[PDB]
Every structure is written in C-alpha cells, then in structure tokens.
Amino acid sequence: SLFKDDIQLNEHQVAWYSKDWTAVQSAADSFKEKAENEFFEIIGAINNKTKCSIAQKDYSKFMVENALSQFPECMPAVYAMNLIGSGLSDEAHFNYLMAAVPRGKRYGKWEDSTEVLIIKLLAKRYQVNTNDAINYKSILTKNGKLPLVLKELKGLVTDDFLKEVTKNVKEQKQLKKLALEW
C-alpha cells in the first residue's frame, strides 16, 4: 500500500517517474491552454489606428474583409480590395485598410441546426443544390408528408455527415435526433 507518512510527489513526478506514458500524456495536457489562444485583434488595430504589425499573425483577406463587410461605412475600401485587392500583399492589405477605414472603436459582432440537417440531407439524396434542397423541404412541409421522406433517409446520417455540420456537441444530439423517425 501507500507508505502513509511519506511525501507524495506531484502527479507530474508520479507519471514521469513511471514509464506509464498515458498518464504523462495526461500531465502535459494540464497546460493545454488552447482555449486561451489569441485570434485577430488586428481588426481592432485596423479601426483604432493601433500598431498592429501583423507579420506573424493569421491574416485572412477572406475574413478581415468579411468582418468589415458587416459595417457599411467600411465597405468602400472593402469593395476596392474585393476588386483590385486580389493578388495584393497581406502586409499591403492591412496597410491599405489602415488609411482606408474611417473611424475606429471596434464594435459588435457579425439557419438553425435541426433544419440544416434536413436541407443538407435532401440535397445529397436527390443530388441537388442548396437552393433546390431548401425549396424541396419548404414544399414538403406543406404537402405529401415530409415525415415520410425523413424516414427514407435515416440510414445515411453518418457521423462523418453529421460532424461536418456543427461539430461542437450537437452532432451527437443530432445523430440520435433523426434516429426516432420510425
């Protein structure tokens, strides 16, 4: 047993002093801090006139433009970078948007799950597009039992299909959501 009144080394020492590496793996995970990442704060520097100095930060014209796509006052420069900003340097992209966005004071933010599984499930079945799939459901909600076609498609709801739309934790409350359809 435990030698009672001896000093117990920390769990790192316990795992490390044992060639049991699965516990050492648990020891390293204790410092993961992946929830404590960074992400942007360059947009805030764009509309605040702050020394961003991106270089190593993850720059995405896809994203950085689409964030200013919500604010219509920043849209003239976003419309330009959409036009001619293709093939323009990342460092140049932030530098153009520096003197291009008006004032700063970074602001707020920027179609549901149980519908979007049916829409994407009808789309793959009949090999149609989103637009066509969306209309299919809307007409099927009105007519010859959409509940019937839900059962026709209970077999091809794989976890690869599911997790592809909303990973998080829903694709398990959605996996066995459309289970009860018989």
Binding site: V78, Q127, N129, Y136, K142, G144
Partner: protein, 318 residues
C-alpha cells in the same frame, strides 16, 4: 408519359425518360433528336439561365434515347479527387454491353469547381473514344472557355409564339396525366391552363406548385396567393430592400451569389416599376457598374453587398 413510381416528389417522379416526352420548343426538339439519331454523343454543354426549363431532364433524356451507360453527378459533389478516382475508373473502362458512356455534371458552373474543371481539359480528350460528358450550366461564363472548346454549347432558345401555344397544352395534357395518375381531383382545368401560363417557362416551379396541393385533393385554388413569386420577388426582394436594413441586406447577399447573372438581370427588370424616374436613371448607373465589374469581383458575395448598400441608400421608393 414516364413515371418513376418509386419516387416521392412529383418533380423527380414525372421526369421524362425520352427526348420526345420533353416539353421543349421547336429547333431544340429538332436539335436533340438530331443528336440522339447519330447514336453517338459528343461533349455537350446545354445551358439555360432560366430555371425549370429542362436542363437536367434533357441531359438525362439524351442519355436514355442514346441508350447510354450514364453516370449522373452534381457538379458541387464533382470535386477533382472525385474526377481522379471514380470518374476516371468509369470513363477508362468499357461497359460490358458496349453502349455510349456519358458523364453528366449537373450545375457545373458552380464557382468552387474551377480547378476540377481545369482537370477535365485533357481528361475529356484522353477518354473521348469511350465516354463523353454532358454539362448542365446555369451561368455559361462559369464554364472555362477550354471546356466550351471541347463541348457543344446548346442554349435553350426563346420559344416562339407557336412554341408557347403548343408547349403549354403539351404541359396541360402532361398535367392531366399526372393528376389522374396521382389521384388529384381536377374539378375542371380552367385555372390549370392559367397556372401553366402563370409560370410559363418554369415547368419545374409549375409542378412544384402542384405539390403543396397533394395534401389537398383539389387542383383548383388561388395558387398565386401562397408563395407565388418564391424566386425573385418573395425572398426579401421587397420588404428587406427599401427599409435599408443594412444588417439584413448583408445577410441576404450570400443566398444568391450562386447565380449572379440571373439575379442582377431580374433585378434590373422588376425594379423599373417600383421606384421614381429620378432613381430610374440612378439605379442603372450603380447596377450597370456592379454588373460591369463582376470579374474583377474577387468575392461575388461582397460585390452584391456593395450593390445593395449603394442601391438602398439612393432609391426614392414611391
């Protein structure tokens, strides 16, 4: 009249199997029959920017009338690794009963498929002896010109007056067969011819409106009441425009970036009747210049968002 009795949606269930059964204008019906008469099919890009004209049915009809070993795939699911794997293993091998091999790519003008499109040039040439490709396009410019080099660009022509008179009653007797085959009570057609004329070219939206009346037993009602113009008018084209809802205007852009050319074109047509002449001349400048630059347009989505913000804040809606 061909019915896939195992089908649950009337659009897919009453799909014509033969090119004859297709309700198509003259010159086209003459063209496709000429193509099927040859017994061998060349690369075809048949395209029509108007929805529900019969792009997908004709593509499948040509595969049937020629007795093809068809592999039908949607363009969106037709990525490049899909072309390397299955599509190649298909067109490389020869079918056991001979017969033409065809690969139909439905709605291949989708934007993300540009690089897999670039794979097909040389793919189509390497296997042109054993297999041809039919491409269904909504926006023809979405097809890289080297593919149009390899394909026959069939554009669905504007149906003449005789074509409109004949196709409607051809669709009428088609609606007679399906309703009598489905069990729907006709209760005298009367409005049935008016429904076909209501959405004349769009036969798919006409059949789709027969659906929603399957729970009902009647064929007659004021169908121009429930989601009539559920295409270019009842999808925030009115309400969300005017009020200058920037938040909604931006969220309404994506749902349409798919087919930019149609949308804009229908946007310049119906708008001429909602706003003042001072904004009539004004809307053409901004819409003309947004359409003028849809190529430099890296992201078509944000290009629509710029059209909406400049359109909503300058139109004197009456």
């Amino acid at each position: 009249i061909t019915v896939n009795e195992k089908e649950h949606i009337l659009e897919q269930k009453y799909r014509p199997s033969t090119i004859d059964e297709c309700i198509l204008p003259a010159f086209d019906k003459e063209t496709f029959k000429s193509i099927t008469s040859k017994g061998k099919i060349p690369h075809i890009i048949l395209h029509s920017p108007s929805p529900g004209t019969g792009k997908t049915t004709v593509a499948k009809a040509l595969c049937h009338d020629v007795n093809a070993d068809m592999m039908f795939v949607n363009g969106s699911d037709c990525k490049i690794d899909f072309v390397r794997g299955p599509l190649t293993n298909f067109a490389s091998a020869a079918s056991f009963d001979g017969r033409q091999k065809v690969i139909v790519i439905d709605e291949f003008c989708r934007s993300g498929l540009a690089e897999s499109q670039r794979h097909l040039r040389s793919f189509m040439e390497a296997y042109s002896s054993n297999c041809s490709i039919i491409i269904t396009a909504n926006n023809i410019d979405g097809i890289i010109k080297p593919l149009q080099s390899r394909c026959r660009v069939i554009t669905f022509g504007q149906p003449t007056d005789e074509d409109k008179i004949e196709m409607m009653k051809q669709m009428i007797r088609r609606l007679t067969e399906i309703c009598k085959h489905e069990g729907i009570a006709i209760a005298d057609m009367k409005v049935v011819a008016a429904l076909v004329k209501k959405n004349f070219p769009d036969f798919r939206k006409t059949i789709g409106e027969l659906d929603s009346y399957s729970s009902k037993g009647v064929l007659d009602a004021g169908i121009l009441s429930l989601v009539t113009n559920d295409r270019g008018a009842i999808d925030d084209v009115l309400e969300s425009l005017k009020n200058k809802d920037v938040k909604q205007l931006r969220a309404l852009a994506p749902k349409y970036a798919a087919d930019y050319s149609w949308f804009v074109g229908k946007l310049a047509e119906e708008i001429y009747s909602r706003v003042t002449p001072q904004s009539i001349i004004r809307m053409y400048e901004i819409v003309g210049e947004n359409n003028q630059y849809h190529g430099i347009a890296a992201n078509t989505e944000l290009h629509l968002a710029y059209l909406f913000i400049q359109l909503a804040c300058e139109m004197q809606w009456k």
